[PDB]
């Protein structure tokens with residue numbers, strides 16, 4: 001029973017909202033992040049699946065994984081996770097425009113696969129891997145947040161969890177987009193998102209830079225008509241790397257590699273470089 | 275006409291009384307609504323006593339882009355029409371863009387539709403007039419196009435006005451918006467879902483889809499069942515696929531005039547070129563007729579909301 005009474009958490013400044021919550025900077029034996037979930041009144045059938053998932057998320061511990069600290073159902077349902085200093089990868093690439101050396105770019109990619117490889121090893125599907133959910137603790141180590149939590153991301157009817165699909169669309173694999181092929185979320189759907197993140201690191205751009213229509217992306221990526229333009233990969237990027245990015249982005253999920261092989265590829269080209 | 279020229283000139287009057295727009299000059303009264311991109315408040319501008327609406331968009335974009343957005347939004351000081359929501363000023367502070375616009379005390383027709391269940395064709399007739407006039411003012415006088423017609427962006431007040439707002443005037447904000455989370459339903463015409471905006475025609479599709487949705491009280495994709503109609507959860511990707519690969523929706527058999535049923539059918543033609551343009555709709559039977567009718571729109575609205583009759 002990993003719950004938390006109301007009076008324990010000192011909720012503070014509202015930080016922002018995402019695809020399934022709003023985050024506040026809280027206090028709880030130190031700074032935490034309090035994300036007030038969107039599904040306000042949950043089902044006793046939903047609530048027991050959410051508790052069950054918290055159990056799996058509490059037993060996760062990795063240097064590249066934001067610690068999950070538990071939850072609280074008191075005023076409203078909420079999630080308490082480690083607070084991170086400094087900016088997300090999204091901010092660094094797309095807002096601050098931080099000028100990392102290409103050697104550090106590859107290292108950001110290495111630690112991220114490193115962390116994903118652990119979640120998959122503990123049979124956890126992220127469902128929301130994007131640079132917004134990757135922080136850089138002390139401008140050094142990579143830390144992946146907002147993993148798992150399928151049960152509170154896809155609101156229920158009473159005993160039926162059906163992903164109505166939410167999240168930012170740029171990292172969604174096509175089969176995820178379509179939401180038809182049974183359970184759409186899978187290891188390879190994360191690998192696909194990971195690929196989009198590579199595209200971020202190698203180009204300093206978000207994908208589909210010339211498309212400015214949300215539903216146009218959803219339809220074309222989901223229909224296999226739209227694909228990130230790999231031309232945009234900057235000139236000083238390893239060939240061995242660009243080929244790795246393209247393996248993760250395969251339109252058919254079964255052709256995508258798994259993270260054991262992926263992490264392998266990055267370390268190989270990490271060594272043999274300077 | 276005369277009452278419009280009075281009202282338009284009266285706005286510019288109250289607009290000069292507002293100077294620089296600083297965040298400390300506003301006191302928050304009530305919330306008006308929220309979407310998946312912004313939140314809007316009814317607020318009072320202390321220096322000038324006016325009451326405006328203040329939309330707050332929170333974007334995480336680089337400051338270079340954000341400053342061009344604010345700069346581009348200032349074209350809104352040129353939109354002066356009785357069919358375009360009034361604009362008081364845009365600025366940036368506390369990590370959010372603010373657009374300050376005139377307060378429309380009736381709300382958007384999306385709210386009004388929920389309070390009304392359905393909207394009577396006689397009303398929708400007058401609504402179509404305003405939307406057509408509004409897209410027109412945007413296409414001629416400014417050569418910009420709405421790109422987001424839907425019931426949420428048609429605003430209405432107790433003086434019987436019907437104004438468009440939230441139209442794509444800022445090129446950089448269009449780009450910035452395209453990293454949004456997925457919505458639940460689209461008003462995007464089928465060409466835009468495969469290609470790009472085909473001038474004013476693709477605004478017109480959305481107008482038609484909005485007319486159907488409001489005429490029947492229900493998102494019309496997929497079209498109602500056989501017995502849900504006599505009673506007078508789809509995936510977002512499938513809706514987009516339905517809009518491209520399926521026949522467009524249409525009004526019910528006998529409930530609406532034939533002139534109205536044809537009007538929306540001319541709006542929902544899947545080919546943007548075979549579809550009707552502004553000059554075509556402007557002289558359609560249903561518009562010719564709905565213009566002649568002396569419908570009391572202001573009172574129908576106040577009734578529908580539960581406010582007492584005005585004037």
Ligand SMILES: Nc1ncnc2c1ncn2[C@@H]1O[C@H](COP(=O)(O)OP(=O)(O)NP(=O)(O)O)[C@@H](O)[C@H]1O
Nearest residue numbers: 015016017018019020023033082083084128132146
């Ligand atoms: N644990 C955390 N510590 C510090 N800041 C955080 C934390 N989690 C999220 N944030 C920040 O809080 C804001 C909202 O986060 P969030 O609700 O996760 O939105 P999102 O990550 O962009 N999309 P998603 O995570 O899929 O819902 C953003 O500015 C994040 O960078």
Ligand SMILES: Nc1ncnc2c1ncn2[C@@H]1O[C@H](COP(=O)(O)OP(=O)(O)NP(=O)(O)O)[C@@H](O)[C@H]1O
Nearest residue numbers: 306307308309310311312314327377378381382426
């Ligand atoms: N100037 C205004 N006066 C009165 N009500 C307004 C005004 N502007 C917006 N609103 C209302 O408040 C809400 C503002 O939401 P808005 O940011 O336009 O999102 P939306 O159009 O409802 N849906 P979306 O486009 O998906 O974000 C809407 O429901 C409107 O009905």
Ligand SMILES: Cn1cnc2c(F)c(Nc3ccc(Br)cc3F)c(C(=O)NOCCO)cc21
Nearest residue numbers: 309311312359373439440441442443444447448
């Ligand atoms: C994509 N794009 C390009 N130019 C834009 C613009 F000028 C907008 N505003 C806007 C316009 C006219 C008025 Br009269 C009042 C407004 F407030 C909006 C907007 O508000 N979209 O709503 C999203 C949910 O917040 C979006 C734009």
Ligand SMILES: [Mg+2]
Nearest residue numbers: 132133145146
């Ligand atoms: Mg996050």
Ligand SMILES: [Mg+2]
Nearest residue numbers: 309426427440
């Ligand atoms: Mg709107």
